[PDB]
Amino acid sequence: SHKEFTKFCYEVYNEIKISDKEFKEKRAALDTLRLCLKRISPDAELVAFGSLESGLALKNSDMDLCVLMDSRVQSDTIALQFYEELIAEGFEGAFLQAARIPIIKLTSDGFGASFQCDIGFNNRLAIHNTLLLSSYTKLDARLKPMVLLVKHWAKRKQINSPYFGTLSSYGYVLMVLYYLIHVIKPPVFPNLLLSPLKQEKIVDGFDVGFDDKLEDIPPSQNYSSLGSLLHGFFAFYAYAFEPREKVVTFRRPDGYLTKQEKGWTKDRYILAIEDPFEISHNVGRTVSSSGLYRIRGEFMAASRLLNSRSYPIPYDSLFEEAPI
């Protein structure tokens, strides 16, 4: 049970994870942008966040960067100077000024036409979200391949499109973490936000505090295989999770929170996933009725495949490209 599925899981993981060549290319891109920035403003710094930073990136990943500056200095000149410099160094793309905040979206140039890099300014909340995810990936070796396999599945099944009514990759990562912390028994992970060792840390009006002294955390008491974990994850969201009523949350000791209790009955609450630090944000706000239908449909198809009576089980079907 799951030994063969586990073998398959790791094989796929090693095929879909970002290659050493691509990683050093992305690192080389980051070093260039940091150079460009250093000449515009020595005191500022360029921080990477998201998948590339936390080690949860698939092949051909895009970049997500953040520029940090003192709050007294009006960004306008620095962000636009940086954009001008990047255009001069061969990148192409957009500068967007929207609601008093600037964003850079680079689209071309290694690094080629393959290049897609989003640059924000003083997006500290995203940095802290990534720090939490990075911490969990350091705590247990099973998490990185589990996340990559789920992201790969969601992309292949066309349920990873927040603009077409389904769910962001970050959403799926939080669904995985919720399952590993609050559903599976024994837990794979403790809840680092609710730990007695957690200290309040207020950043931009939110508490981003969590227990980050990972060295002192004992080994997981869950000894199940990657295959077993995945099998469990698909079954939970296929059958047990009740999206009409319940909220995926990192703020309850037992993981129990209803939409009514939360007060989450164009932001949708069809699928409700409470962001662990920015708790007023529903990461699932992009999911529509038809989108949830397809997401639930694919969880059931995945779970049914993994429990097939027919041998041998066509495990490759799990990552088979869906129509539409």
Residue numbers in the entry: 40 to 148, 152 to 307, 321 to 379
Lines quoted from the article behind this entry:
One such TUT family member, Cid1 from Schizosaccharomyces pombe, is a now well-characterized TUT, which was first demonstrated to be localized to the cytoplasm and to possess poly(A) polymerase activity in vitro, but more recently has been shown to possess TUT or poly(U) polymerase activity, in vitro and in vivo. The TUTactivity of Cid1 has been shown to be important in promoting mRNA degradation of polyadenylated and 3′ trimmed transcripts mediated by Lsm1–7 and the exonuclease Dis3l2 (12,13). Cid1 has been extensively characterized both structurally and biochemically, revealing that a single histidine (H336) in the nucleotide recognition motif (NRM) is predominantly responsible for discriminating uracil over other bases via a mechanism that was proposed to involve two alternative conformations of the H336 side chain. We used an RNA-binding-defective mutant of Cid1 (K133A/R137A/R277A/K282A) to improve the resolution of our crystal diffraction for higher resolution studies.
We have successfully improved the resolution of diffraction of our crystals, resulting in a higher resolution (1.74 Å) crystal structure of Cid1. The structure determined to 1.74 Å contains two molecules in the asymmetric unit with one chain exhibiting a typical Apo conformation and the other having a significantly different conformation. In one of the molecules in the asymmetric unit of our high resolution structure (chain A), presented here, we observe that indeed H336 adopts two conformations via a 180° rotation about the χ2 bond. Unexpectedly, this H336 flipping occurs as a result of a double conformation of the D330 side chain, which was clearly visible in the unbiased electron density. Therefore, the H336 flipping previously reported, which was inferred by analysis of the refined structure, has now been observed directly and can be explained by the hydrogen bonding network with D330 and several water molecules. Of the two molecules in the asymmetric unit of the high resolution crystal structure described in this paper, it was clear from the excellent quality unbiased electron density that the NTD of chain B had adopted an unusual conformation. This conformation is related to one seen in our previous report but the mutant enzyme used for this study is trapped in an intermediate stage compared to the previous closed form. Dyndom analysis indicates a pivot point for the domain motion of this ‘intermediate’ structure as residues 163–172, supporting the idea that there is an inherent flexibility within the enzyme between the two domains and that there is a single hinge point about which it occurs. We analysed the volume of the catalytic cleft of Cid1 and its intermediate closed conformer using 3V, and found that in a native open conformation the catalytic cleft volume accessible by solvent is 3339Å3 whereas the NTD rotation reduces the volume of the catalytic cleft by approximately a factor of 10 (336 Å3).
